[PDB]
Every structure is written in structure tokens, then in C-alpha cells.
User: Fold this.
Amino acid sequence: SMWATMEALDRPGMSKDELYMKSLRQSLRAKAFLDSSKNAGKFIPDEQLLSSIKRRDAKDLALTAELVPVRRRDRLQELVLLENKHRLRE
Amino acid sequence: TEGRLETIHNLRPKNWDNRRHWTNWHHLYDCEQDHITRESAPFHDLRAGGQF
Amino acid sequence: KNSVARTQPKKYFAHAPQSENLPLAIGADFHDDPINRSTLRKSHNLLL
Amino acid sequence: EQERDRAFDDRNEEVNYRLYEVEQKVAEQRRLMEKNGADFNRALAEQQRR
Amino acid sequence: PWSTGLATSEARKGAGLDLTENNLPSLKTYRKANLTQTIGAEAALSSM
Amino acid sequence: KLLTIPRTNNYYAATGGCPCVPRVAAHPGSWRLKEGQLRSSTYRCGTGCIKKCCHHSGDQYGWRRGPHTVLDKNTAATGKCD
Amino acid sequence: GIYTINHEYHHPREEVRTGETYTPAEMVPGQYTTMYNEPLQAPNNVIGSTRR
Amino acid sequence: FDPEYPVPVNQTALNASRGRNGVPEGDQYTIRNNSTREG
Amino acid sequence: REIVSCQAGQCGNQIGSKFWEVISDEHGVDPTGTYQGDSDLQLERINVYFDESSGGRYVPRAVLMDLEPGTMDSVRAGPYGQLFRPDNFIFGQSGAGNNWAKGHYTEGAELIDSVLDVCRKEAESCDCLQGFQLSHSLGGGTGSGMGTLLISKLREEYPDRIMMTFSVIPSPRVSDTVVEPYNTTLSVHQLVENSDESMCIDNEALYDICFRTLKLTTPTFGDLNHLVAAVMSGVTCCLRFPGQLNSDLRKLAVNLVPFPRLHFFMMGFAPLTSRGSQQYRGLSVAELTQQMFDAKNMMQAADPRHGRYLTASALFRGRMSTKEVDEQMLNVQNKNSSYFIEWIPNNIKSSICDIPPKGLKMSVTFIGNNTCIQEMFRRVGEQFTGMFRRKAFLHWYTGEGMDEMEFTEAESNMNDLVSEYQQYQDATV
Amino acid sequence: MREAICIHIGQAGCQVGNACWELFCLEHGIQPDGSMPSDKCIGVEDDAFNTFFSETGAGKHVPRCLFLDLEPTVVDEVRTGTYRQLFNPEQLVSGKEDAANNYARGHYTIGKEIVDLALDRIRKLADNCTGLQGFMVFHAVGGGTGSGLGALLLERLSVDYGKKSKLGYTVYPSPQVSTAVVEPYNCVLSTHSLLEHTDVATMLDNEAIYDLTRRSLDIERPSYTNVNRLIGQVVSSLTASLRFDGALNVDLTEFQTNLVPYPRIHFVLTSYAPVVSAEKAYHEQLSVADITNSVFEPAGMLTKCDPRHGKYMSCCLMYRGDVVPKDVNAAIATIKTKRTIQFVDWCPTGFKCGINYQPPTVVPGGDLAKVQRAVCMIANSTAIAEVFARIDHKFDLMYSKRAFVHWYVGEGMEEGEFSEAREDLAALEKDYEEVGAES
Amino acid sequence: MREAICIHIGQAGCQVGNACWELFCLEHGIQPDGSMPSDKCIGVEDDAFNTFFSETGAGKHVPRCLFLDLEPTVVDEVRTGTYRQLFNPEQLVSGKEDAANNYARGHYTIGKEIVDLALDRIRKLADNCTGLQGFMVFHAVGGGTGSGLGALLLERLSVDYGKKSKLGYTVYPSPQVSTAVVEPYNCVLSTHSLLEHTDVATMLDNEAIYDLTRRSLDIERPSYTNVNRLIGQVVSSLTASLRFDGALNVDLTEFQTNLVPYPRIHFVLTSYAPVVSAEKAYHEQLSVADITNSVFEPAGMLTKCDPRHGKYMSCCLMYRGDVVPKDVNAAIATIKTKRTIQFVDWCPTGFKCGINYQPPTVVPGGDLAKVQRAVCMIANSTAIAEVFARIDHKFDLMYSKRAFVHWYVGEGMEEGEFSEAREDLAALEKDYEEVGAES
Ligand SMILES: Nc1nc2c(ncn2[C@@H]2O[C@H](COP(=O)(O)OP(=O)(O)OP(=O)(O)O)[C@@H](O)[C@H]2O)c(=O)[nH]1
Ligand SMILES: Nc1nc2c(ncn2[C@@H]2O[C@H](COP(=O)(O)OP(=O)(O)OP(=O)(O)O)[C@@H](O)[C@H]2O)c(=O)[nH]1
Ligand SMILES: Nc1nc2c(ncn2[C@@H]2O[C@H](COP(=O)(O)OP(=O)(O)O)[C@@H](O)[C@H]2O)c(=O)[nH]1
Ligand SMILES: [Mg+2]
Ligand SMILES: [Mg+2]
Ligand SMILES: [Zn+2]
Assistant:
């Protein structure tokens, strides 16, 4: 709150009018964040959340692929494991 | 006469001597240089006698 | 619902090119100058 | 052609100076109006002192 | 001479020469060009 | 920005003082009254020589604060607006 | 930030006159005629119109 | 707004780089010309 | 070929009053309406703007729209106020209150019945109607809201007519309301799909024309509106008078609009010079071209050097020659080709009319589809975003019944139009 | 058409209306008695007077205004004054007992039994009017009937007249000087109605008006008469756009919607210039730029609050006289550069302009010099929170000990009303601060 | 264009400004009423008065001046004097109590209750000038107001107007003639403003003017009126280049750049010749060479400092009348030839010349005599360090045992202010000697 912000921004020598200015700025930034989050559903496009969706999907797919093997990909990896020899000798 | 074929300095619009002309873009003719120097109209006050 | 006797006033604009025998060139609109207008008071012309 | 150009130029110049005359007349009318306003203000000053 | 060309030795314009619309070398100025309507509806009007 | 900031009762509650103008035992239109009522009159940038991202001011413009202290309960935390 | 000039040193000329009385319609020479009936250019004729 | 961009290209230089010298064989709208060289 | 004029709002009615001033002067019509022409030509195409009355006089085909009867009364008391037909004046008890919502949904909705009655009445009286010319201001309430309502709802009845709109745009420097972004955005995302062509005038540029060129000490709205009235007349000079190379509104739209959304134009007028400076300058087409392509002669407060020209049109008036008039256009295109779009060859369409404006040997009206027109749209869209982000001045528009999504729709359409104006500006071949 | 019904509440409102009418009659050519000259069939050739006066069944002009006072001294003075025949015998509502500087008395006991009669007179005025633009209320929040009865009248006007504009001009307690002890209570309680049941409220504090007269009009001992003359000049400047020909017409709805960003934020600070004495006037070239600078300067301010301590949100400048767009736009451009004045980030435009060709008029015996041009600002700015902070801090001091609350209880109001008034003023300061905050 | 604002501080400033403004009015044919009745020689609407007089709607020519003094004696007598109509009732503002030759009192206590209004009036004056050249501040540092309030005004003007020109016509305590006893304290304490916020500080001490007038004008009894008339003549000679036409026109910054070699080496002595009596004048042929030599002599100089003890750094000559540039060229040649005056080695040219067509205007009833040509020299030279090295010696003698320091420290000024001013002045003599030293 107000007292908490004044305690947090305890900078000596600095003008305490400027202290009130900064505390007001933080408090109203928090209030504006709350107000904007109440109605951001309509304003924010769906494409914005796509980045976070992709990050979560990549993490989940990594966690799943860390365990499950596939024989169809096993044939592919048997085809692989020699082209890498080709690359290192080349 | 801001740019001139008369002088040595090329004050012409950038790459006007090899501009987008009917002689080179989809067409192509050996008359490309002749047609650029012939259709550079406002730099023809002197060479053309002022005609288009 | 005003007076029925009253009529639409006539507003005389002092200097107009048509009245002065001059063309209506750009910058020659001296009749639209408020000082050249007889009365600055505004009437209800349509309702009268 | 040259005669027509010169004729238009002379007539335009005459009309331009007539326009300048009427513009200066209205400017002088405004100047006289604010002179009279200043005189009114001065008279009101003496009246307020009185 | 051209308008931009030198008029130093250009022929002087005679005093009797008329440099107006009526002396423009046009069909209306051509002497044996019979512009008045001899035959037609406009001729019938002119005959009234 | 120190002029942008409003001189709200919230400001006085957090700062210490009241929007009530200071009542000073002074003759009207005097230097003593002006120093008692305005904070731009007694402003002084620093103390002595500096030896014994630059410095900026803008807090001395306003009025001196009253002797009373604004209780928090008289102040609203939120206000209805958009 | 805008240049201004006094009327005393910026005004049209009073030293030029033609002694011609003309309505603004007749002011501009040939200003009510086309290029098919009158292709060429020539001045008008008004009261007091002389060679200039 | 940068007046220079977009930069006007050189069609002569573009043809020289692309090798756009001609079609001696001829196309649907072109002509089999023996005079043209390097294509 | 018939053009029906509609003047919306205070600004629109004043501009129309002075437009009918200049048109009556050009067609030899006195304030009482009687014809005092000096040749056949004035009467031969007087039907274009004037419907013939009974006793040999003429009545303008103009519809005056204003929820405030004040500007109505000022127009009527004007020197040519008696020229207009009485029932063509339409007004209400209370004004729009500088609100687009009030002018477009609540206060302008009752009078729109009579306004459409009058416009339709003036529609069949035309042998072959060419279009509707509406003059209004985007920042107002009645001129913006009610005017754009008329623009939107006349296209449905008359899709094949040219819809020409003189929009007097706002400017932050010229801000004389506080809801300019809201009003002009609500007007523009309607004019985009409901106007065949929309030319924009900025009061900043009008003031600057008075400052630089006219050098008038005290120029009022009369002198200010003469500048735009001259161009309004010079667009249809080719309609009203014969010329060597004729054009109409449809031909102007065809030669000026490459893509239908891009139909916003910035205009200029020539010749323009202070009275004392007219002696040093010779009046010819060579000087007229320089005056057009001089940016200080624009009625748009945007610099043509800050964009490219999609298209341009010069409606020349006055007796001239067709050779050097095209020579000037070729020269300017070639030597400012960095400011003309390459893939649109010969960006400038020049039309020639024989009859010049009264008192001028030769004049011209410039209509340019410059890509710099995106500058105003981007600036006022940024202002609109700043106001709508913190929900400023919404309650006036919202309590009139309007939805929150309308402003977002307008913002999207504005950013979209700026997007074409940029992506065709920087486009390659 | 374009009528605007004027309302005067309390002694302050009634005297301000008297000084407004001595100006309106003189400006529109109506005699103080109201009748026409005997030889003339019609007193005034035009109907520019229509907005303030309605012609009668004898040809003479009765004003489109109501006076309203719970005590009979001021209204009886109006009856016995030089305008005894101009004003209607009705529309001059008088009570037999005042409100005694008590909002509860003016709102709940004495006000309720006279407010309906006042609304009957107002309804007759509105029926007479055919193009009513709105209501033009004048009063003082520091009085009994001015605050409580004015509040009740505004509430009834809001419920009965729809969304019709209700402009208000109210005299607030001064930061320094006051003529009452319960004035903070009255102002705090009146801010309820003035915060919900009015469109735009105008600060008219007597301390700043006195300072204006002293420093500029050179009146060493000014009075309520001079103060009300200045107020009438401001009101005439605001209203003259619909009465006289002008470049940029501005109406009541126009400048009430171009002024307020939020329904709660509608309290505006107003200034008028060039306010100069006759001796001052012929010494200065009162140009458009000079008068604009004087208006934006706190010296020309009519409210004892410094706008430099807040942020401007919407300024409506009404220019009168020989002003020109050649100069007003230049003055605006050069005043936006000045950094004492400063706008909220969410309102970049922030300016409305209304130009009228009619210069201000001169009242006999008045101290206003004849000026070729004038300009009045109606400015909504966040700096107005200062006076609210001061007034409700005085309210808190007076309310901690429950002082003078017994008078309000005896005149019929709950103490919860005091509590809610204080809470709503605190909320008003909070959202003033919020809208002053940046994005 | 070319406007210049004159600010007079203290009694000495007001006394100087009275003579300056009467002489300006006589230059421009402006009566104390402030009008131009009829002048055949004056062209139609000719404006060479724009630098010092601003046109008014009343046709008046209001001076661009601001008179200040903390007590109303001189202010009131000017307000009731001859130029009541010429001078605005404002722009001529006064306090109520004098500074009493207390720099601390005039800079911290009594100066601050009027400096705000001083800045307001200066801003009002500057808003009317579209080509403001700069500010000329006339004061004597030996007093209370002129030192303290003058320093405060200069410090505030520096931040209010940026890099605009400041020309401080300052009357230092002369080596022998000096009124006050705390005058050395005031002069030393006011050194920071003159070092930093004044772009060029011109010397106008009284003893040198007294010697000049007694030896050259041949009047046994001149007065403050006479010395102020001479000072006004000097100021008019300086401003004639930007007022009237001339062969070589020089502006404030034009001679600032040529006269100030180093950031604070800007304290410059003044001289003027031919100063001549009525009987003296019409018997001599005052050649340009003769008047230039009289200027460079140390007896026709307005500052009591002998140039032979220092190095000349840069001399700016202002010639008025029928002077041909060859005469001044020969004067420069013979000045460089003659040895008893020596220029500093690193400044070869060291000379600026400005010729103005209009000759000086005699003031009958005063003391001067009509002369066909005149010249005023403003000289930056290292010899000016002597007056500083004398005033600081007096300051040290006075301050060794804390004499007269309680008055200063009781007005809200720290004790260290005296030490800071003394150290700054000492650095002034130090770098004067440094720049005077040969390479
Ligand atoms: N500007 C101005 N303010 C006035 C005037 N008369 C009274 N006031 C203000 O009103 C306050 C006094 O209370 P009133 O408004 O007279 O009270 P009231 O409206 O008559 O209501 P009651 O107190 O019940 O009689 C003073 O503090 C003034 O600020 C006036 O003539 N002009
Ligand atoms: N040249 C000139 N100097 C003057 C004149 N009057 C006063 N002085 C100077 O003023 C000095 C005395 O300072 P003060 O008597 O305090 O006057 P002040 O500097 O204006 O300061 P205060 O009057 O105390 O407010 C003297 O040494 C003079 O040099 C004058 O008329 N002409
Ligand atoms: N050029 C010009 N513009 C005007 C005139 N009057 C108003 N405007 C413009 O119109 C805009 C405001 O329109 P407004 O009067 O509110 O229209 P309304 O609400 O429909 O009556 C402003 O931005 C002005 O710049 C005028 O006489 N001439
Ligand atoms: Mg009372
Ligand atoms: Mg003194
Ligand atoms: Zn308090």
C-alpha cells in the first residue's frame, strides 16, 4: 500500500515530494494493470498468446519425447548413424 | 537543365541512363542507349533543340 | 412563438467585389469582414 | 499574343491596386475604431478619477 | 522571331495595324468567307 | 513532474501537514507573511560551496503546509473512474 | 516564425494606368471564348482601349 | 519516408547478370534470330 | 450531368455559402436569383448546379443540414442567403453537441427523414444525375456524424453516382475541439467505404496559405473559405464550361484512384500570390505548374516531399496551349521521379477548360493522391489510441447507444488504410 | 430558438443574476423597464434577444430567467428596483424564512416545500421556450438555500428535464477568506448534487475575483457589485456565441461535451482576460497572443487555484471581438510550447475554440474598460483538486468533534449523509489524481 | 525588431533611467504624453523607436522599461512627475521598505517579495518583442536593492531567458568617492551575479564622471542629474547602431563577441568624447582623431582606472554623426602607433568600430552642447583589475574583525557567503593578471 511503498523506497537525501511522486506512480501502475487485465480479453489479439502457447507446447513435447521411443523412427535412426560418419570423415 | 547531357557530371535521377524503359525491362533492343538518350526529354533543351 | 409583427432583418455587407465592380478574387472578401457587416447581432432568419 | 498578355497584366495590376485601396480603407476604418476605443478608455479613466 | 528570341531587328508594327480580336486571321476575318446564313432556319430568322 | 503531481489530501496525509493555509502572526503583504505562507520564498539550493543527471528542483513552488496532520481514515484508497 | 512585410513597401503599383472602363467579365481578354471559334489569342476592346 | 528507397534498379546490369541476352531458337512470341549471340 | 450539393454542419454550411457565392459569380446569378450573364456559356450549363425556377431565375440544388439552426440563420442572412430554396433548410430544436454519436444515431436520426426526402426530391429533377457533393468537417458533430450518415445511406439508393466529399480535417495544432480523434475517425472509417472520392482540407494549411501567399493582415473565414470554394468550383469547371480536354467527376476518380480504398486526396490551387508580389510574377502555365507543385500551396498540412504520388490531376482553366501544359507534367514527373511512383507511369492527368475564373487569365486546381496523406491518418490514429486507451471522453459516445467495438473497428480500419498507403508507397515492381 | 433558461438561487445567485441582467438588457437593447419606445411598434428590430428574453402580449420583453430565494429581502429589492417592470411578477419565487446557511434546512425542510413551485415556474418557462439549449444556474455552495435548495432544484431538473444541459456557476469558499463557519459543511454537502446532477460546474470564488479587481481593475475597495459584474461578463462571453454572429459558433452542449472526459470529472476552472481598468487599457496593445497569455497566467484566474500545480485536460477558449484565426491559432501554438501549462498525456488536443465577432459591452458605472477583443477560458484541469482537498480537510476538522451537526440533524438529515459526502469527496480527489496520472 | 528591454534597479537605477528615457524621448520625438503630433522630417509611419518604445492601440509609445526599488520614494515621484502618461502605472513597480544597503536583505528577504512580479512584468514586456536583442540592467552595486535584488533578478533572468544578451551598467564604489560604509560588502557580495549572469558589465563609477565633468564641461557644480545625463548619452551612443542607420551597424551580440575574449573576462570600462560645454563647443573643430585621442586619454574616461597600469584587450568604438571610416581608420593607426597605451600581445586587431549616421542629440537646459560628431569607447583591459584589487582590500580590512556582519547574517545569509565572494573576486584579479601576462 501507500505506507509499504514509502517504506520500500526509503532513499535518503532524495526529496520526499519526489518520493510521493514515485509511490503514486507505482500504485497507479498497479491499479492500471488491474483495470487493463479486467478487459484485456477483447483487446488483446489471439496471436499474442501464441508465443507462450508455443513455448509450453515445446516444453511438454520435450518432456514426452524424453521417454517414448518409436520403431518407425528407429529405422530412420538406423539409416542415420552412418551419414554422421560420412560428415566427420568429410 | 538541372541535369545536362551537355556537362560531364551526372545530375540525372539515379540510374536514369539505365532506367526502367520499354527497351530493356520485358523487351530488349540493341537500341537501348539510343532510346534512353532520345527519351530523356527535359535533358533535351540543347541536344534536341528543346523539342520533346 | 415570438412576435408575428417582426420580420427578417436585412444585413448590409459593406465592400463586395460585385457591388464595387471588381472580380471575386482570392483575398477580396471584404464583405465577410465583421467590421464591414452592419449588425453583428444574430437573428432567427428561417423562423421569420 | 504578347499584346493580350500585356493587356491582362495591366488590367490585373489596376484591379489589384483598387483591391489594395479598399483593403486600406477597411484597415483605416479598423484603426479609427480602435482610436475611438482608446479615447473612450481615456475618458473613462478621467471619469473614474473624478 | 520567337518570344524568347531576339526582337532587335524584328519588323516594326505599323500604326494602322490592329492588334485585337477583330483582326485575328480567322474564317470570320476572311473577306470572301460568307459567314452570314444565306440559307437555312437561321436565315429564315434573319429574314424576320 | 513535481508540478504535475496533484496537491491532494492523500498527498498531505502521506507527506505530513494539511492543505489549510498557514496562519502566521504577520502584517498583510510582508516578507514575514510571504515566508510563512509560501515555500518558494525560503528555498535555498544546497549549503555552501560544493567542495565543502544533474541536480534539479521544482518542489518549492506551492504553499506552506498547515499545522494539522491528515488522518488516513479521511482518505479514499480507490476512486470510481475509467 | 512567419515572414511579414509592411504594406508601405509591399503594395501593387499606382504608376500604371490604361484609362479603360471594363466589367470583370470583359477584364481578362477573351475570357468568355473557346479555342474552336477563336483559336488564337488577342486582347479585348473596351472604352479607352488603345495600343500598349 | 526515404526518397531513395526503393532504389531504382539497373535493367542493363540486371540483364547482364542474369545473362538475359536473347533466345536464338525463338519462343511463342519471339523470333528465331541467327544474329543474336550468347543466347 | 447533374451534381447535387449537401452542406453539413457549421463548417459545411459556411463553405457551401461561399461556394455558392463563387458559383453564382461564375454563372452570373445575383443574390435575388435572376440571371445577368454576359454570354451563352454561363446559361448553357447552368443546370449543373442550378435548377431553373419559374421566372427566369435559378435556385441552387443544395441541401442545408444542421441540427443547430444558428448556422442556417447565418447562411440565410448572408448576402446570397435568399438564393437558396426555403424548405431545403433542415434543422432541429437542439444541436448535435459536437458529438458524432449524437449526429449519427440519436439527434440526426429524426431529421434524416426530411433530409432524404429533400435529397430524393432533388434527385429525380435531374435529367442525368452525376453525383452528390457533400461539404462537411470531420471534427464536428453535425457535419461529421450526420454528414457521414448521409454519405453512407445515399450510396445504397444511388450506387452508380459519384460521391464526392469535401472533408475539413482537424489538426492538433488547430485543435478547436477535444474529441477530434473520435469524430474524425468515426467519420473516416465511414467515408472509406461510402465515398467515391474524399478530398481533405486542413485549417492549418488554410491559415498557412493566408500567412505565406496571400499575406493578408486580418484574413477571416470569408477569405479562408474562398480558397476552398475556388477548388470546389474548379473541380467541375470542366462540367460547367467547354474545354480543349474535358473531364468529369467519374473521369477524375478513374484517373486518380488506383485502388478503391485509396481515394483520399490533398488539393492545391493556383495562381496564388499576394497583391504586391503579383507584379514580379508572369502568369503562365509554367508558373502555374510551379505553384501547384509548391508544397506551401496545398490545402493539406502535409509535405509532398514526405511521400510519393500515387496519382495527380491538374484541372487547368483558361486559354492555354496543350503542348507545354503536358511538357510541364513530363518535366516534373521526370525530375521528381523520386517522389512519383515508378510502376504508375505518367502519374499526372491534366484536363484543360477554356473558361478561367473571373479575374484570372489562367488558373488550375490540383488534386493529388499523395502517399503522405498517411501522415495525418497515423497522427490522428495515435491520438485516438491515446484517448481510447485510458477511456477518455467515451461516456458521451457510449451513452448514446454506441458499442465499444465501434471505436476498435475504426482504429483497425484507420491502421489498415495507413497500411495500404505505406505498402504501396514503398512497393517495388 | 436557442433559448437558455437562467436560474438564480440564494442571495449570491440573485445578485449575480441582477448584474447579469443589467448587462444582457443593455447588450441586446432592452430598457430596464422592458417596454418599447412609444413611437416604435417593435422595440428591437432583431430577435437576438430571444435566448434571454421572451416578448409578451404587450410587445415588451420578460427575461427567460427565474429568481429563487427562501428569504424575501433580495427578491423584494428586485421587485422595488429599477427592473421592477422587466421581470415577471412570478418567476421570482420568495420564501418567508431563509435556510440559515444550513444545507439540511435548504434541502430537506424548507427546500422541499418550495422546490415544486419553483419547478412549476420553470416548466412554464420551458413551455414558453421552443428551442431550449439548457439551464444556466447561478448560486453559491457556501449558503443555505444556495447549496441545499440549489441541489434539490438541480436534482428535480435532472429527473424532469432528461439529459438537457445544466451549466452551473457557483461561488465556492475561498482558500483564505470566508463569511461563514458552516460553509465547509454546506460546500461538501452540495458537492453531492454538483457531482452527479450537473453537466459543467464553474468555480467563482470571491477571493480570486477580489484579487482580479485589485491588481487589474485598480479598485482599491471592490465589492459584490464589481464581482458580479465580472461574473456577468464571463457568462455573457460564454453565451454570446449563440446570440451574435461569429466565426466559430459554440453552444452549451458543444462546450459541455468538449470539456469533461468523465462524468465525475466535470468541475472546471475559468478565467477571463483582458480584465484591465481604463487607465490600464490605453497603455497596452491587447493582442490575441497577449490576452491568451494573460488567460493562461494565474494572475487572470477567477479561481484561487494555481493551474501550474496540476495538468490541463480541456480548455475551451471563447474569443470575442476583432479576433482572427490569423492570430488565435498562433497564440495557441505558442502557448502549447510554454511548459508552466501542461496537459495529460491522454488528451493531446485539449483545446476548443469559439470565435464571436461581437466585442464585450460596457455597463454604466462599471470598472471594465472598453476592449476591442476579449477571451474567456473554461478549463477542466487536475489542479482543481487543491480546493477540494482544502474544503474537505476543513470538513474533517469540523467533523471530528461532530460540531454543528446538530443543526443539520434538527433540519432533517442523517449523519450518514455527512459520511457519504466525505467519502465521495475523497473518491473525487482519488480519481482526479488517477486521471492526472500518466499512462 | 531589434527591441531591447531596460531594467533599472534601485534608486541609482531609477535615477539613471529617468535621464536615459528623457533622452530617448528626445531622440524619437515622443512627448511625455507619449504621442507623435506632426513631423515633416519623419516618414509615414517610420519606426526607429521600436527598440525602446512599443506601439499601443492608443497610438502611444510605451517604453520597454521596468523600474524597481524596494521603497516608493523615487518610484512615487516618477509616478507623479512629468512622464506619468509615458510610463505605465505598472512596469514601474516598487516595494514598501528599503534594503538599507544590505545585500542579504535585498537578495533574500525584501528582494524576493517583489522579484516574482519583476519577472512577470519582464515576461509581459518580452512577449511584445519579436526581435528582442537583450536586457540592459542599470544599477549601482554599492547599495542594498541594486546589489541584492539586482543579483537575484539577473540570476532569475539567466534561467528565464537562456543565452540572451545581458548588459549591466554598474556603478561600483569609486576609489575615493563612495557613500555607504557597508558599500564594499555590497560590491563584493554582488560579484557573482556580475561574473556569471551578466554577459557584459560596463563601469559607470561616480568619481570619474565627476572629474570628467569638472575638468571638461567647465561647470563647478554638476550633480546626479548631470552624471545620469552623461550615462544616458553613453547608453544612447551604444544603442544608436541598432536604432538608426549607419555605415557600420553593430548589435548587442555583435560587440559582445568582439569584447569578451574569455568566458568571464567581461568587465569593461567606459569613455565618451567630446564632452563639451556650450561656450567650449563653438570654438573648436572637433576632428575624429582629436575626439578618439580624448577618448583614449585617461581624463575623458568614465571609469576611475588608469589604463597605463594595464594592457588593452579589446576596444569597441561607437561613432555618431558625420564620421567617415577613414577618420576612424587613421585614429586606429595612430593609436596603435602611440606607445603610452599598450595592447595585449595576443590581440593584434583589438579594435571594433561602429559608425552611425545620426549625431548625438543635445539636451538644452541640461549640461551638454550640440556637437557634429561623438564617440563612446567600451574597453576590456587588464587595468580594470586595480579597482577590484582595491575593493577587495577594503573588504578584507572591513571583514578582518567581523565588522558589520551581524546585519548580513541576520537576514538569512550564511557567513560563508562573504568568504565565497572574496575568493571569487580574488580569482578575478588572478585571471586578469594571467590574461594580462605576456605569452
Ligand atoms: N460572487 C458573489 N458571491 C456572493 C454574493 N453574495 C453572497 N455571495 C457568496 O455567498 C456566501 C454567503 O452565503 P449566501 O450565498 O448569501 O447564502 P444564501 O444563498 O443566501 O442562503 P442562506 O444562507 O440560507 O441565506 C458568501 O461567502 C459569498 O461567497 C455576491 O453578490 N457575489
Ligand atoms: N551615477 C549615479 N549613481 C547614483 C545615483 N544615485 C545613487 N547612485 C549610487 O548609489 C550609491 C549608493 O547606494 P544606495 O544609496 O543604497 O542606492 P541603491 O544602490 O539604489 O540601493 P538602495 O537605495 O539602498 O535601495 C552611491 O554610491 C552612488 O554611486 C545617480 O543618480 N547617478
Ligand atoms: N475552413 C473552414 N473551416 C471551418 C469553418 N468553421 C468551422 N470550421 C472547421 O470545422 C471544425 C468544427 O466543426 P463544427 O463547427 O463543430 O461542425 P458541427 O458540429 O457539425 O457544427 C473545426 O475543426 C473547424 O476547423 C469555416 O468557416 N471555414
Ligand atoms: Mg441569504
Ligand atoms: Mg533606495
Ligand atoms: Zn489542515
